[PDB]
């Protein structure tokens, strides 16, 4: 194997060892459930929807929600596009540039929604008949292994670069088990479960952080908050 | 921190800013109990007698006097603002916020220098003076 594959094996092994070593038993706690509480109110209904449909709904809702966050602050010179790219409509003055400076909360939510939009859009391309199942799986495998280039959340929370490297390492581990024999290089691998797991586990830990950041931001939008000794 | 005069509502803040035509009104927005505010207030207290000919120092609690929080963006623990004849005097400290000193100053002489620079520049009708020292770094090494 090449050197990159060997180091990929060693890094996957390193993180396996670290997970096994740092593992502490889960703590006893009261059974809090979020969606059960949401369903207990009159503001939430239940249905059974196609996954592609609810994915499109989530993409549209995230776009509308960030766009409302932008239009609340009267930033008409800024444009949030549907691939979740903040764009300057015109050449912006320095006073406009400093008023168009968002925190890592907005940009991290924006980039997570960008990744979700890419995934759901690949699925939509599958459902429209433009792209077939094998190329859909290859596209998802490419997406979950190339998040460092399709999106840009590494520049607002750089620790997730750890995930990106992992998603590259797995890409090696799978590829050199996949591209053996009559199978050469080029696209075609669709074993996207490996990187999909990694990004789900990233979201597992980021959900409380992003929720806290966005709660602070939205509370701030609506006038709310939530040599020593001598 | 407690020797300096305190301003107890926004009207008193506005009158203190208006009551001076020949001295720089230096106002510290913050909470007396805050560590950064106490550090800044020690320095302001140690220089308050030395600059009484061209500067007056008042303190303001940003909870007991909340009117200037949205107006002056008083969302830092400590904030030091300079006014000369009912005009906010911006100062280019090199920190990217030319409107206030939103940190605690460790030197008695640096704040005297800043106050004197603000006074001398504002007498000439300048809305922005330039601080004698760049605070874009801390020169630690």
């Amino acid at each position: 194997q090449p050197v990159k594959v060997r180091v990929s094996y060693q890094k996957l092994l390193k993180y396996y060892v670290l997970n096994a070593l740092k593992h502490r038993p889960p703590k006893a706690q009261k059974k809090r459930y979020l969606f059960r509480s949401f369903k207990a109110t009159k503001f939430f209904q239940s249905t059974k929807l196609d996954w592609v449909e609810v994915g499109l709904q989530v993409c549209r809702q995230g776009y509308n929600m960030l766009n409302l966050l932008i239009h609340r602050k009267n930033l008409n010179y800024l444009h949030l596009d549907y691939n979740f790219n903040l764009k300057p409509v015109k050449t912006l003055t320095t006073k406009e540039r400093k008023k168009s400076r968002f925190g890592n909360a907005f940009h991290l939510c924006r980039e997570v929604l960008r990744l979700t939009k890419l995934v759901v859009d690949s699925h939509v391309q599958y459902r429209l008949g433009n792209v077939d199942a094998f190329q859909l799986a290859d596209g998802l495998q490419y997406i979950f292994a190339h998040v460092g280039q399709l999106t840009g959340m590494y520049r607002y929370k750089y620790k997730l670069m750890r995930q990106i490297r992992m998603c590259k390492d797995l890409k090696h581990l799978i590829y050199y088990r996949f591209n053996t024999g009559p199978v050469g290089k080029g696209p075609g691998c669709g074993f996207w479960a490996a990187g999909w797991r990694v990004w789900l586990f990233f979201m597992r830990g980021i959900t409380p952080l992003l929720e806290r950041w966005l709660g602070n931001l939205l509370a701030r939008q609506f006038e709310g908050r939530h040599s020593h000794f001598d | 921190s407690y020797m300096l005069p305190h301003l107890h509502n926004g009207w008193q803040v506005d009158q203190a800013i208006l009551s001076e035509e020949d001295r720089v009104v230096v106002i510290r927005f913050g909470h007396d109990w805050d560590p950064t505010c106490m550090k800044m207030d020690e320095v302001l207290y140690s220089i308050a007698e030395k600059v009484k000919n061209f500067a007056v120092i008042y303190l303001v609690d940003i909870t007991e006097v909340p009117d200037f929080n949205k107006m002056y963006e008083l969302y830092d623990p400590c904030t030091v603002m300079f006014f000369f004849r009912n005009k906010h005097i911006m100062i280019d400290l090199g920190t990217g916020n030319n409107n206030k000193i939103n940190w605690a100053m460790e030197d008695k002489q640096e704040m005297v220098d800043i106050i004197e620079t603000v006074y001398r520049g504002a007498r000439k009708g300048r809305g922005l003076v330039v601080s004698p020292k760049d605070y874009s770094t801390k020169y630690r090494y």
């Binding site: 939008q221 | 926004g10 506005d14 963006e73 409107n99």
Partner: peptide
């Protein structure tokens, strides 16, 4: 004056004439 009370009808933000900064976006609700 020090110790004096505030007048009833008075906005102490622009009662003398002074405008804000808007240094950035995600600090304060514009």
């Amino acid at each position: 004056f020090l110790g004096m009370p505030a007048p009833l009808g008075y906005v102490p933000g622009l009662g003398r004439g002074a405008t804000g900064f808007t240094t950035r976006s995600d600090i304060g609700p514009a």
